[PDB]
Design an enzyme around this catalytic site. Sequence first.
Site, PDB file in Angstrom:
ATOM      1  N   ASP A 103       3.128   3.872  -1.553  1.00  0.00           N
ATOM      2  CA  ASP A 103       2.712   5.101  -0.952  1.00  0.00           C
ATOM      3  C   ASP A 103       2.460   4.623   0.673  1.00  0.00           C
ATOM      4  O   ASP A 103       1.930   3.538   0.798  1.00  0.00           O
ATOM      5  CB  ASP A 103       1.476   5.774  -1.288  1.00  0.00           C
ATOM      6  CG  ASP A 103       1.494   6.194  -2.846  1.00  0.00           C
ATOM      7  OD1 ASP A 103       2.909   6.834  -3.030  1.00  0.00           O
ATOM      8  OD2 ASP A 103       0.555   6.217  -3.628  1.00  0.00           O
ATOM      9  N   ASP A 127       1.081   1.214  -8.434  1.00  0.00           N
ATOM     10  CA  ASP A 127       1.796   1.491  -7.064  1.00  0.00           C
ATOM     11  C   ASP A 127       1.146   0.515  -6.052  1.00  0.00           C
ATOM     12  O   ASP A 127       0.230  -0.149  -6.270  1.00  0.00           O
ATOM     13  CB  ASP A 127       1.769   2.926  -6.452  1.00  0.00           C
ATOM     14  CG  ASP A 127       0.304   3.650  -6.312  1.00  0.00           C
ATOM     15  OD1 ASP A 127      -0.750   2.539  -6.048  1.00  0.00           O
ATOM     16  OD2 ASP A 127       0.144   4.650  -5.759  1.00  0.00           O
ATOM     17  N   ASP A 135      -0.130   0.593  -1.951  1.00  0.00           N
ATOM     18  CA  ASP A 135      -0.448   1.558  -1.089  1.00  0.00           C
ATOM     19  C   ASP A 135      -0.456   1.123   0.252  1.00  0.00           C
ATOM     20  O   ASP A 135      -1.117  -0.338   0.137  1.00  0.00           O
ATOM     21  CB  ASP A 135      -1.776   2.296  -1.213  1.00  0.00           C
ATOM     22  CG  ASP A 135      -1.851   2.905  -2.819  1.00  0.00           C
ATOM     23  OD1 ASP A 135      -0.749   3.636  -3.017  1.00  0.00           O
ATOM     24  OD2 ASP A 135      -2.866   2.696  -3.428  1.00  0.00           O
TER      25      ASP A 135
HETATM   26  N1  LIG Z   1      -8.057  10.910  -6.780  1.00  0.00           N
HETATM   27  C1  LIG Z   1      -7.874   9.843  -5.840  1.00  0.00           C
HETATM   28  C2  LIG Z   1      -6.776   9.027  -5.844  1.00  0.00           C
HETATM   29  C3  LIG Z   1      -6.423   8.035  -4.750  1.00  0.00           C
HETATM   30  N2  LIG Z   1      -7.792   7.958  -4.024  1.00  0.00           N
HETATM   31  C4  LIG Z   1      -7.891   6.986  -2.842  1.00  0.00           C
HETATM   32  C5  LIG Z   1      -8.527   5.814  -3.327  1.00  0.00           C
HETATM   33  C6  LIG Z   1      -7.728   4.969  -4.104  1.00  0.00           C
HETATM   34  C7  LIG Z   1      -6.467   4.923  -3.178  1.00  0.00           C
HETATM   35  C8  LIG Z   1      -5.493   4.494  -4.004  1.00  0.00           C
HETATM   36  O1  LIG Z   1      -4.797   5.392  -4.880  1.00  0.00           O
HETATM   37  P1  LIG Z   1      -4.128   4.964  -6.039  1.00  0.00           P
HETATM   38  O2  LIG Z   1      -2.925   4.236  -6.097  1.00  0.00           O
HETATM   39  O3  LIG Z   1      -4.019   6.204  -6.751  1.00  0.00           O
HETATM   40  O4  LIG Z   1      -5.500   4.124  -6.726  1.00  0.00           O
HETATM   41  P2  LIG Z   1      -5.485   2.636  -7.059  1.00  0.00           P
HETATM   42  O5  LIG Z   1      -6.773   2.168  -6.683  1.00  0.00           O
HETATM   43  O6  LIG Z   1      -4.480   2.070  -6.147  1.00  0.00           O
HETATM   44  O7  LIG Z   1      -4.806   2.322  -8.354  1.00  0.00           O
HETATM   45  P3  LIG Z   1      -3.667   1.648  -8.804  1.00  0.00           P
HETATM   46  O8  LIG Z   1      -3.914   0.160  -8.622  1.00  0.00           O
HETATM   47  O9  LIG Z   1      -3.420   2.139 -10.390  1.00  0.00           O
HETATM   48  O10 LIG Z   1      -2.507   2.253  -7.960  1.00  0.00           O
HETATM   49  O11 LIG Z   1      -6.452   6.414  -2.578  1.00  0.00           O
HETATM   50  C9  LIG Z   1      -8.833   8.833  -3.938  1.00  0.00           C
HETATM   51  O12 LIG Z   1      -9.844   8.649  -3.146  1.00  0.00           O
HETATM   52  N3  LIG Z   1      -8.680   9.630  -5.003  1.00  0.00           N
HETATM   53 MG   LIG Z   2      -2.454   2.275  -5.436  1.00  0.00          MG
HETATM   54 MG   LIG Z   3      -1.476   5.750  -4.467  1.00  0.00          MG
END
Ligand SMILES: Nc1ccn([C@H]2CC[C@@H](COP(=O)(O)OP(=O)(O)OP(=O)(O)O)O2)c(=O)n1
Ligand SMILES: [Mg+2]
Ligand SMILES: [Mg+2]
Length: 340
Positions: A264, A196, A198
């Site tokens: 997001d 995703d 963000d």
């Molecule tokens: N269980 C989680 C999920 C998310 N986050 C926080 C830190 C990461 C940030 C990003 O959400 P994700 O998209 O789920 O993390 P990601 O680093 O962006 O991995 P991806 O590149 O696969 O989206 O939100 C967190 O602290 N704990």
């Molecule tokens: Mg992310």
């Molecule tokens: Mg996310």
Amino acid sequence: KKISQYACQRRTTLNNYNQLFTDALDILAENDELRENEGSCLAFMRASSVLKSLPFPITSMKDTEGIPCLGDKVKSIIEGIIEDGESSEAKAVLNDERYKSFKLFTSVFGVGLKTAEKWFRMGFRTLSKIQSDKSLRFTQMQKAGFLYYEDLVSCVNRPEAEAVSMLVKEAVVTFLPDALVTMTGGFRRGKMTGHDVDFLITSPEATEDEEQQLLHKVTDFWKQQGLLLYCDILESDHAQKCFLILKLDHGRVHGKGWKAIRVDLVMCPYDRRAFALLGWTGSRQFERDLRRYATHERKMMLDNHALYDRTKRVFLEAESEEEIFAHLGLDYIEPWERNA
DNA sequence: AAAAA
DNA sequence: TTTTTGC
DNA sequence: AAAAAC
Ligand SMILES: Nc1ccn([C@H]2CC[C@@H](COP(=O)(O)OP(=O)(O)OP(=O)(O)O)O2)c(=O)n1
Ligand SMILES: [Mg+2]
Ligand SMILES: [Mg+2]
Ligand code: NA
């Protein structure tokens, strides 16, 4: 140099020298999540995280001396991989029918542990059999998950993430021209791919009501353009946020002519933007350890909104991430070094 | 499953 | 040993 | 009326 058990006291860059070990530990962790073993799951995630931080590859058992988060069970797994380049434990999980089904079913947006377990116990093994079933009832989230499955499964790349950033900024400034939009998550940590994109949105001059209406205004604007493929807004992590699927036209990125992208958006009060940026930059493991370090080592409470000192009974202020690290008594870790 | 209490 | 693991 | 979106 004594390696800390906390990811927030380690520099974890994307150059992983121990992917043979961490891929195996990530599989074992995922299996413990599925088996609802939270403790064993977390122990394998911490072992995997510490190995990701190493500036060298493990080539012998002697190399593991002094490394924290590596108990007897984990050292048995490392020993086995040193032996023949493979993990028998991770291989058993990869061949397990429950594990295969859980990975496959949860790869659908809108399907988590509970629904994946339900479908497995109903005898489903393929996504084709789930989608074509006439008795199953799908949530609006799952309908979107199946409709845009191939796009969502192949992850986002940096040209796509940058193209999404442009779309988010363009939409946000039409309703709040002074708004600051920052790409957070994996892409801020320097990742070349992500599941995703963000964003953290904040405005120095917006009112409490203006702050509340922005995500509704931006999504209505995209709905009008026919770019909103899915939208779920969570009202004011306690901040207002939305989980979206956006239509990204191929012409905007430097077949059907577009790609569905998971996006997001998080809206936070301007003052708290350092705590929110820190929380939303991640990684998940870095965030957990930051909060765990703050609690167990400093008797502080940290979250995406604030930093509280339990001894002094005072909230600590911060205008940047650097100030949060300094309050916690931690050396500053750059976003690209938070890939725990 | 590992480390702190 | 029991408790904690992002409260 | 959980359940996912973590
Ligand atoms: N269980 C989680 C999920 C998310 N986050 C926080 C830190 C990461 C940030 C990003 O959400 P994700 O998209 O789920 O993390 P990601 O680093 O962006 O991995 P991806 O590149 O696969 O989206 O939100 C967190 O602290 N704990
Ligand atoms: Mg992310
Ligand atoms: Mg996310
Ligand atoms: Na999912």
